[PDB]
């Protein structure tokens, strides 16, 4: 929750599970950050498209 970053806490949980279990093992895959980057990607596409469009329109 919190809007909290996926990049954080997983390392906290990393040591956490490295503790509650005697050895690192959980080997979990990262969340949300992939959503973060794909969001940046799609919005980036919005940037390219909308910007070139609007520039062309200004040229109009």
């Amino acid at each position: 929750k919190e809007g909290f970053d996926s990049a954080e806490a997983e390392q906290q949980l990393t040591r956490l599970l490295s503790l509650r279990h005697g050895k690192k093992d959980f080997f979990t895959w990262n969340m949300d950050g992939v959503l973060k980057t794909v969001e940046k990607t799609t919005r980036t596409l919005q940037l390219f498209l909308t910007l070139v469009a609007v520039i062309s329109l200004v040229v109009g």
């Binding site: 070139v52 062309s56 040229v59 109009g60």
Partner: protein, 53 residues
């Protein structure tokens, strides 16, 4: 006759150069309006095709 049509092409090519000479600046803004357009056309076509490649 097509003789006066092609002679029309080149002689009114000269007449065109003169009419543009009447407004080189207007001609400039006009042609630029063309240029940015088509250049952007081929631009986006090629780049999109390339990224697609």
């Amino acid at each position: 006759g097509w003789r006066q049509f092609v002679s029309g092409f080149n002689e009114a090519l000269t007449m065109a150069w003169r009419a543009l000479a009447a407004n080189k600046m207007r001609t400039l803004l006009t042609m630029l309006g063309i240029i940015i357009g088509i250049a952007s056309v081929v631009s986006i076509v090629v780049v999109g095709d390339a990224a697609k490649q």
